[model samples]
Target: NAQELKERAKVKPIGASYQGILDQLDLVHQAKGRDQIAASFELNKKINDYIAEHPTSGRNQALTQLKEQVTSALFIGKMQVAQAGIDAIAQTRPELAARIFMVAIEEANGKHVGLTDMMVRWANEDPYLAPKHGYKGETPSDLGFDAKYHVDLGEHYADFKQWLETSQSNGLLSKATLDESTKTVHLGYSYQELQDLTGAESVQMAFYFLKEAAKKADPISGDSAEMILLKKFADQSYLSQLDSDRMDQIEGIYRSSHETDIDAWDRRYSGTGYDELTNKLASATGVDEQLAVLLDDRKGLLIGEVHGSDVNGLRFVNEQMDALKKQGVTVIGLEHLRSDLAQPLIDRYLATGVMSSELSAMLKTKHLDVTLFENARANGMRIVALDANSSARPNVQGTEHGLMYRAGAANNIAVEVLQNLPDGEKFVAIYGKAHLQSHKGIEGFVPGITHRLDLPALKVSDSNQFTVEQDDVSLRVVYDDVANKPKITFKG
Candidate 1:
């Protein structure tokens, strides 16, 4: 069977233009009447089985196997699973799996975006994962659910503080009201008086108590605190049940409550920080004539550079502008400069060389719109927003936010930019290093589009000194003597 399957293979040479290979494969399958979805599903299973059978193989062998499997799948129709699969290969040979995906991007000339922020995200995801890169201290508690803990939450933590008379709880409930009310409640099930004590009675009774409590409480927010107390009790009892049917509805609200609340708590500390910078690395990296590395063997290449503490990483593109323009480059694409922002922002920046503070903060780099854009403008380059916002990615959130979401969007947007450009006028997409790795054998921006388009481009990745390789992609690190200096050609 193995020999027969191997002989049956059509994808050859694992050459450049993998996207093209996939296209032809799709056409052939349709000629014979085969479904792309089913073909990919079976391929995914075979890949999993192969990896499971060879768990102890060399990492490079593992990576190559994955690439071939993906190559074969995409060659036949399509193949995919969670970037880090729970089914088999992803969860087991993770390093190889990621590397194989990187190969896809290198050969396909795609981009992967979203996160360098994801580097730590992976650390955060794996419960037993030992934190690397300055990850010290007790790991965040995954105390999934400690029922009794919610029961006495108020006793454990307090939020309210005031100047004149320090009081707690948004709208505190009257002691008389709470003492008078029973500690019982039920849902639509039944009520205490009707021989069916239910969560509803508690709700019905609590409803009167809560509304009255809100209306009667001296400070308006006290009722919020009352709701907090009731909600706490509710979570304490309801969660433990974990009833399949009851939970079907209950699951939706509880998860978002925490996720949204957690998002709010985490939102304020946000800006382009480590999460923004490092997870971008998980998408992957390396170096070369750098531009040549991205272009592989062509002139039209996409270069993806990892972000850093400041926007200094962007300066590298300046050196290549002339080289890129020499290669028929007509456009420059960046993460924050989406379609809407690109044209308008470029107009505003070129007109006044100044922008509104709100937009400046939103874009996060002053000179990003200033010098860098001016450089592109000087070179007759059209700037396209390489990465845009997206929320339709649940599985893509390998970390906080849509790590894959933006990368995937970045790939899609880059394709749109490519599509709109003049027929023979080439373009250079410079985005978060992660976005260029779509074909990198992981969930990414590059693969997101390459599967649909014949993107025969090259990708060159730049990052901190550490490097990795599978087979198709290669990396060699270079470090400058100057501290934190990120460029060989320009100083930011």
Candidate 2:
């Protein structure tokens, strides 16, 4: 009984306790034969069952350990069969047949061995493999077998290892240099030459050479062979700056154009002043001869208290106003008085048969009447207030000064006022000369008002035009001072 137990223990540890009740048999070797081979086939099933039963012990760890044991056992069993199979074939077939069978077994066993090794390596190294393939649970150790195999194979190659080390070292250098030399050459040779010398093509090697060259060059002057070459390539044929003679020629062109414009304007305006033209029109149309005559003489006249001593100019405007009154061209508008004085002026003309105190005061101060007002009252003409008031604050004036501030608003307002006026009435708008030029003046404020009224706008200015000249050119040309002269001074 004891001997049997010992024998059973040697074969299968679980069979030892039952030996006393059972016959001592040769089942040990029998069990190890075909049965052992068959067990290899069930390896995956057994491992899977074990993992399912031991749920608490994480599936990845449990399954991986189970896989290692099963695959290893299977491979060992396969190796044993391969050896036996080869021996049997050799005994019978001798040469070619035996060799083929042996090779087949070896290949199968080799694959098993490779797979076993891969599982073991993956279990030890990679833990984050299963998630990539959409496995929700912790990955089994067997999951990264393929990845580990390749990694191990890569490690075996000297060239790959060398490249990895070189890249790492370059990365370290890049960090130190603040990555400035990353794309530049750290060596001396050109790209092609470097490639030829090293028998290697690399972006890093080229950057190294470029970086080295840049370091050697002067930072301030940027002087280097490369810089010189770059400058030479960049040099394009550039034109020279304009010389003094060329500048003079250009300025002469502008002056000639300006002179032509001035001549045209002078010729246009020389025919008749506004007053003279208006008078001629009145006479031709048989509208109001007296008014026409008055307008003809005084249309170009400028009357101001500042020049009141100039009796000729004052008499001229007064006579024109008087004539307009006699011509039955009554409606007179004055810009000098405030809106509040308009009613009083109107009433005074209606009752006292004379200009209102406000109108008289304005005339006395400005040395001009509401010539339009006086004409309107005498001829029973309708009066209109042409000038804007404080009520129309910020309105566009259309004059140079006013345009600078409110030309847009003035234009809009002028259009509205002009559009509402009667068609047959002869209307006169008397504003400052600043407002009377085409678009640059007041007439520009209302688009079609000028044409609609069949009225002419006259701009009156002083007869004299003035200009200032610098001493620099005058001294040399007019005073004949070719040589530098001492500054003339009279100290107070």
Candidate 3:
């Protein structure tokens, strides 16, 4: 190992990757149980543990002294003990690891890659580690390529420029993969074909997003960069809490905003064509307001009672907030309010009681009188926009409903977020009345509130305020034996 390290140290460093090779020559997991399942677990723990120890170091200097050590192991024909760690190390610095892998492969040349298969496989991650972009500064086209790969780079297209910052993500930019199928400038990669990426044989194919991450959230979401980069291609016999999902648009998903969407969404949601649909629903009367049975501890969500276009609902929402406060509500999840536009602004208000510039812009843009959110923030309650920020949209042909799309995305996110709140403090999910219209888990979600959380629907009747012909749909809150999966009634 000493001789090998000395001999290889003769190579002078001139470039970044080379510097990485020199300084990092540098730094750089396991489990098993179910036979294939058992053995797989034992092996993965070793690989993941090694890569995780060093994260922020460019290729993220993982395990340091181990690089040269493995070099001797490979040359001396003793890869069995060090191969796994070496393979994991190879991912971040394909420069150092690949050369060692090349030698190990040579040793096994034409024989059996068997345990050494990982030697060649680890390069699949950042193959530039295998030369091309990093070492060679050359096009990595020859390393690998494929078309059948499905790629979805982004989610929203309403105002592409305002919602995205391509320069922020680098080679894995959100701008590259177009959602041609949806033509909707989306964010979440729902499988689009990338000749450059998918084409890069196994070497480049390591970078793909097939995940179950918290939707409708980005900066606000669980950042799985570490989860994606290190363990995506390699085995993760021992990793946890990895934020998984589309990797491309994780940067643009959310931003700091203090702006209110009253003007944009209000105008878009009220007194017009969309409003016409609300008035069309027949209102129901003599409905029992048995608040107790519904607002039970098991029931925390409240939806429906009036038209989504009901400006009166604002005052009514204020009234409900006050009354529900005593009942233990802590967080207020808003519907259709894109969190991507302004989460920092919200954090500011929450952290220091300072208003977010972005939030200021949003409220100013909507020309709204601070929907219930103002009071929510004033009271020190956590507020999150439970809506699509453009990145949560799906790629299916008939999947264009952004509002519904975002709501569904929050199901798991909501459940996870809510669990952290104080047990005594409840959460109130605020969305348009339409979400609470049926009480059924339509489109995999119960309107705006994510499923598995049982909450009472505060149906606000508007008979006294409206005219005769406006009585059709009514809010039907569902309750079942389960805690969160409460079922609502549907009367067509």
Clashes of each: 48, 23, 74
Expressed as tens digits, the lDDT of each residue in 360-430 for candidate 2 is 44344444545644544555655444333212222122213223122222323333344465543333444
Model 2 TM-score is 0.25
lDDT score of model 3? Answer: 0.36
Taking every candidate in turn, the Cα RMSD to the unseen true structure, in Å, is 23.6, 43.8, 19.3
Among these predicted structures, which one has the highest lDDT? Answer: 3
lDDT for model 1 comes to 0.35
Per-residue lDDT tens digits of candidate 3, residues 1-492? 322433453443443433433343323212222222222222233333444754444332322334434334343444454455544554443334434344444444433222233223223322222222101111223323211112122443323322233322322323233344543222222122121123222212223322221122133434343222222221121111111232111211111011112234323333362445334333322112223323444546544433435544345545556555666667776553455444555777777866643355455443335555567766667776554322344322232323333333444344445556776777666455544332322212233332234332344444422221221123222223222532221111
Question: TM-scores for all candidates?
Answer: 0.32, 0.25, 0.36
lDDT per residue, candidate 1, 208-242, as tens digits? 34333323432444334333333233332322232
Query: CA lDDT of 445 in candidate 3?
Result: 21
Candidate 2, residue 271: Cα displacement in angstroms equals 14
State each model's CA lDDT, in order: 0.35, 0.31, 0.36
**Greater-TM-score candidate between 1 and 3:** 3
